[PDB]
From Swiss-Prot:
It is found in: Secreted; Cytoplasm; Cell membrane. This is Internalin B. The N-terminus (36-79) resembles a truncated EF hand, the LRR region (80-240) has a curved form, while residues 241-321 form an Ig-like region; the whole region forms a curved tube. The LRR domain alone (31-241) binds mammalian MET and stimulates its Tyr-phosphorylation; the LRR plus Ig-like region (36-321) are required for receptor dimerization; adding the B-repeat allows the protein to scatter host cell colonies, and the GW domains, especially GW2 and GW3, potentiate MET activation. It comes from Listeria monocytogenes serovar 1/2a (strain ATCC BAA-679 / EGD-e). Residues 286-357 are annotated as: B repeat region. Its main location: secreted. One of its GO terms (molecular function) is lipid binding.
Amino acid sequence: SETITVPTPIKQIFSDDAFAETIKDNLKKKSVTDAVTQNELNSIDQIIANNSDIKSVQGIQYLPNVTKLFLNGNKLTDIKPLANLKNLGWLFLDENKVKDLSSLKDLKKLKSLSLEHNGISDINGLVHLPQLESLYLGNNKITDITVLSRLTKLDTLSLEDNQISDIVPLAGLTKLQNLYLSKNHISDLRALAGLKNLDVLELFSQECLNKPINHQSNLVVPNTVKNTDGSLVTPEIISDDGDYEKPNVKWHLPEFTNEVSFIFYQPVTIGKAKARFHGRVTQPLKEVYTVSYDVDGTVIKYKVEAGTRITAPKPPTKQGYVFKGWYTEKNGGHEWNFNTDYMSGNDFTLYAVFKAE
């Protein structure tokens, strides 16, 4: 059960020493040894216990009327004791390690939820809280916010300092008024174009990472940074002395380098909200050269990354002759060993050598 029928010492119900002291102070008792009644436990509407070294709230099940719980900055990992607090409307759990959200499933009066700095990546359990009005998820490990398209009553939402690139799930959340998206992986603002009720919008310090491409002396990278109307954002500064020739960023790279980048900056206005959309696009580069195989003057070419293993060709054949291997010159040089001789740091040709039977 989750009710007491006799006066019971606080510390017998609340075994975490810090949380027992919290309840002692809440009920204005002298000591955690003091006995309390269910009537007294029924009177608790709000608990404030931030920065209190609490490891477990076991015992809170006995507080059926609690509507507000402030537990930022503790050592919590499990919220199963909250599962049947059906009147909970405010739940603040910043700076804990609460990742299992299954026990929120039946908290259908919850309107404000805060879970910043909890190491969270999976937020699919929030599908059970479509009535949420304020949601704070800053400083986590989130990439997939698909579930938020169902949280259509949100007017206040923080997702800052995560790893999000796809914000299309926010496109239909027209009640949004305060929206915090700085320090993500956002390069494309089209999803925000229909958010007419914004008053506070933050979009600074995005970090966007392209898939690697091969280095070239005359490198061309498409600009992929898009404003709310789809137009391309002009770069603010380009690495390695490159330049912009819309829609492409271009570089002259005579020597290999394993990365180039550019920074963008765009003042944005969405409804009433003004923001600075800004960040960096990083382009990793692979060092790739070509091995050419020459059989009696006919050549086929393969691209291979420097310092990696080359796969041998099909052995050539020539009637009246025996193939003797691939050599570094047509009439001289030395034989290539594909298991030990990895790809050189430059283009080169190997030549088939034959011997008469």
